[PDB]
Design a protein around this ligand. Structure first.
Ligand code: 24F
Ligand code: 24F
Ligand code: 24F
Ligand code: 24F
Ligand code: CA
Ligand code: CA
Ligand code: CA
Ligand code: CA
Ligand code: CA
Ligand code: CA
Ligand code: CA
Ligand code: CA
Ligand code: CA
Ligand code: CA
Ligand code: CA
Ligand code: CA
Ligand code: CA
Ligand code: CA
Ligand code: ZN
Ligand code: ZN
Ligand code: ZN
Ligand code: ZN
Ligand code: ZN
Ligand code: ZN
Ligand code: ZN
Ligand code: ZN
Lengths: 164, 166, 164, 166
């Protein structure tokens, strides 16, 4: 027999992600680089490995949309909600949605896609918000080295991987 | 930091359930009996007890639906997905949905409601899938053709590891 | 070439319906009789013909549910919203949903299923609400002969069928 | 009584559109050109004019998505449904969604975006399906392999019956 695990987490270290569509704000390569770096933030401190899928069903489905986009959390136009991601689980579990009514960038202007994505993927992997104002998982965006609180949090779920 | 802690088991032994709607495939009475029997599978070997409510919110909300039915875990027509249930917790936690595109029965035809419900309720109470091919909590549905059902030891073990013996 | 028709309506006279599930409040036959009678209200004054399907995809999919049930119009518990139906069209077009947190009956108690359904099927066929307080399509439930305003409305869309 | 009257055509000749997001299959520039060309198919033979907006609400909101994407008319993976658009009107009226589980291209491979968009925009402007197998508004997709596209007379007739000639 098997009881469910103590916390929401992926039961496998090899996870896939798919960039379903793209924002008008950045080139395809800029978006790909931002997400690749956001996933590396987490894989650098755990045994997690992420492989990008170009089509089909990935564990983490990434998309850009506005207002109603297929779930119970419609976006709200410019500002306000920026993006959201679902905790580990089947179907929409792990997926990350970005509000395309925001201006996504690879700079300090608008909202930095890499930073928001790194935060969203923390949710995709099982982390909720932190009370630490310097943590990546703090609930408010402010514009890289993963803070220690986020390292302790993610490793409590998946272990450290190679500590080297 | 904070993670998403999971409710490993119900913190109370007295649970409530409500049959929100009914399948066209069986009589109301047949449906009620199948669910009662399915809960008894688990209550018989633990301190758990189930009470049926006819209105309002119950811990375990039971309903039949097809395709997209309110939780974005859509069903898929005949075959494939049969039903699903959420693990212990508030709101949708514990709830069980049955795909009415399946033909539900009190026999070997289509899918036996009692057997599928008993399996789903295992999930509702905190049990994941077993690796023992003879367990109720095994992921594949099979029907014995017998009029009596005996909860396999693996399931007794699992459920009791969470709630203790009755 | 073909432009779209002037009003939302079914482009065929032969329509199907399927009772997907049933309310705990009445027997299966009582529900079937209530819906059969509700459809006859409309077929008796137009060329429409309704055939019940036991499975598969019907033009008019009928179901009972509570709160969130698969669309943008979640129900609200006892009282308030009673049911709703979508105007003619593909997929959810024409479908009718009944709030099972209400008590459905074949009497004057609770909400009469036949009466509410007859009203909902008017929507399923293309009628919106009427200002006539005696009309079946009036927006407020009050507890059979189809009122003249509803006859004029439905025939403006489908014609009278056999006037005999 | 009241029925649900349909907006037979846009009451203004100057329409706006916005490309909300982009497919992974083509460059932003390729996508923009395909949509511009698709609108021009219709504006070339009518008094209609289209203006691209980069933010806010436009009459014709264009987006790519998969499966359930916000309107409960879910897409279905590779093949089958390619895209859909709503007839003239407020809100979702005029909007066009493309199934990104299809491979969109500027050629004969997968589905040609320009050709499918031109067809969808026909719907956005008030045209239903034609019965003429050689029409853009015919329900079945076919690709000529030619670098130039000429709006068939049947479509010119249909669109002009609604908006008049240019
Ligand atoms: C150096 C600090 O780094 C960062 C970077 C980004 C963020 C944020 C990204 C998105 C937001 S938000 O304001 O849009 N809120 C969302 C979030 O925090 O992810 C929430 C998630 C939960 N919600 C939700 O809809 O849950 C669903 C997914 C179950 C509502 C929006 S803050 C915070 C800190
Ligand atoms: C003597 C053997 O007895 C049985 C009786 C029934 C079953 C099954 C019932 C339903 C299925 S299934 O193929 O539909 N899978 C579901 C399940 O195992 O219950 C899962 C549940 C989790 N799912 C899901 O989406 O859950 C969400 C709601 C969290 C996907 C389907 S097998 C298996 C063995
Ligand atoms: C002798 C008079 O006979 C009757 C019988 C029943 C009714 C009613 C049935 C349901 C209601 S309601 O209060 O629940 N409102 C719904 C309705 O009028 O059908 C509306 C429909 C539109 N809505 C909606 O969600 O639209 C969706 C379907 C597009 C909101 C609820 S009144 C009115 C008169
Ligand atoms: C030279 C020939 O040129 C063409 C180019 C493209 C097409 C097609 C594009 C998309 C399709 S489809 O098979 O996906 N059907 C859709 C369509 O015809 O546009 C319909 C639209 C209406 N739908 C729908 O659900 O609309 C809702 C949103 C109201 C269902 C799919 S065929 C046909 C001919
Ligand atoms: Ca590592
Ligand atoms: Ca926003
Ligand atoms: Ca997922
Ligand atoms: Ca944007
Ligand atoms: Ca519950
Ligand atoms: Ca199924
Ligand atoms: Ca069934
Ligand atoms: Ca008739
Ligand atoms: Ca209600
Ligand atoms: Ca329908
Ligand atoms: Ca009820
Ligand atoms: Ca629009
Ligand atoms: Ca498709
Ligand atoms: Ca694609
Ligand atoms: Zn979302
Ligand atoms: Zn967050
Ligand atoms: Zn469900
Ligand atoms: Zn199971
Ligand atoms: Zn509904
Ligand atoms: Zn109404
Ligand atoms: Zn759509
Ligand atoms: Zn079409």
């Amino acid at each position: 027999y098997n009881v469910f695990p103590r916390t929401l987490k992926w039961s496998k270290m090899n996870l896939t992600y798919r960039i379903v569509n793209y924002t008008p704000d950045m080139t395809h390569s800029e978006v790909e680089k931002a997400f690749k770096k956001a996933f590396k933030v987490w894989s650098d401190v755990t045994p997690l490995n992420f492989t990008r899928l170009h089509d089909g069903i990935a564990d983490i489905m990434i998309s850009f949309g506005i207002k109603e986009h297929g779930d119970f959390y419609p976006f709200d136009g410019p500002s306000g909600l920026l993006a959201h991601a679902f905790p580990p689980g089947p179907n929409y579990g792990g997926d990350a949605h970005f509000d395309d009514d925001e201006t996504w960038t690879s700079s300090s202007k608008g909202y930095n896609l890499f930073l928001v994505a790194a935060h969203e993927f923390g949710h995709s992997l099982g982390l909720d918000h932190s009370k630490d104002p310097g943590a990546l998982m703090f609930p408010i965006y402010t514009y890289f080295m993963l803070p220690d609180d986020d390292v302790q949090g993610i490793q409590s779920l998946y272990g450290p991987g190679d500590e080297d």
